[PDB]
Swiss-Prot record, chains A, B:
Included stretch of the parent chain: 33 to 169 of 178
Annotated consequence of substituting Q57H: In variant C; found only in the Jersey breed
Organism: Bos taurus
Name of the encoding gene: LGB
Protein family (similarity comment): Belongs to the calycin superfamily. Lipocalin family.
Subunit comment: Under physiological conditions beta-lactoglobulin exists as an equilibrium mixture of monomeric and dimeric forms. Interaction with LMBR1L which mediates the endocytosis of LGB has been observed in PubMed:17991420, but not in PubMed:23964685.
Source superkingdom: Eukaryota
Protein's name according to its UniProt entry: Beta-lactoglobulin
Annotated disulfide bonds: C98-C111, C98-A113
Tissues in which the protein is found: Synthesized in mammary gland and secreted in milk.
Localisation: Secreted
Changes after translation: Alternate disulfide bonds occur in equal amounts in all variants examined.
Function: Primary component of whey, it binds retinol and is probably involved in the transport of that molecule.
């Protein structure tokens, strides 16, 4: 399991994001545009309470991630996953997160690199690959954010 | 455009191989088991003349790669590709190659890491990623060689 960010300022992740890259432990989770975890993030909507709404494109999808005692871990109930982990962000340019089913990570771990603009950002990708370096990924995809936007 | 091995001893690549990892410039080339370049190498069969027969599983497939003046470049007429390039090998453990359509690389470049045993070999994977590092890949897959075998 990836380590989560210390000192996440949750309200600062608000607004528009684009999915630049995705990676997963199981090829089947990401392998076509209709694969279960091929979801493209369009907005992060933190709530006054400290929870995190995630709006996605597949068709639109709305996932609410409920806060926990760890500022960077959230609970969900969607996509056959139950946890969202924020690995790292600088709020203004890139954000890295993963989703897993905490009771079966090896069939469920899927991570993304999100960016604030429709540009490919090679530094965000380097940070994404370093984050994934010890994780057991079998598919990694990178996108031109323009296409889905 | 990846560079090819100097001093390829072609006859030494003969015999059984397994596809450990695949990567491609276009996601669609590799994205399902029925993707055009999702082909699993089972044997490399060099010919007396210096050409290179490649046996693959999708269903079996036989590709004959014809020699050129470059010992590590071959010509093919299959999978909508026309060139096979041997990037690096040590004959006894791992081999890296790419196929491309020399007239449209960005839509066709697909590379693999092959291994001699049904084991995951993390060093062959590191060499494969290093070979890929400046190439424009958008999908990378890695396999347990046991499965297809």
């Amino acid at each position: 399991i990836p380590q989560t960010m210390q000192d996440l300022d949750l309200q600062e992740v608000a607004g528009t994001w684009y999915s630049l890259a995705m990676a997963a432990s199981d090829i089947s989770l990401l392998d076509s545009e209709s694969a279960p975890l091929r979801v493209y993030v369009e907005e992060l909507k933190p709530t006054p309470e400290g929870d995190l709404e995630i709006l996605l494109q597949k068709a639109q999808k709305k996932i609410i991630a409920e806060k926990t005692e760890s500022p960077a871990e959230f609970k969900i109930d969607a996509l056959d996953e139950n946890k969202v982990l924020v690995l790292d962000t600088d709020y203004k340019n890139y954000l890295l997160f993963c989703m897993e089913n905490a009771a079966t990570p090896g069939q469920s771990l899927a991570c993304q690199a999100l960016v604030r603009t429709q540009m490919v950002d090679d530094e965000a990708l380097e940070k994404f690959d370093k984050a994934l370096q010890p994780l057991p990924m079998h598919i990694r995809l990178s996108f031109n954010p323009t296409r889905m936007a």
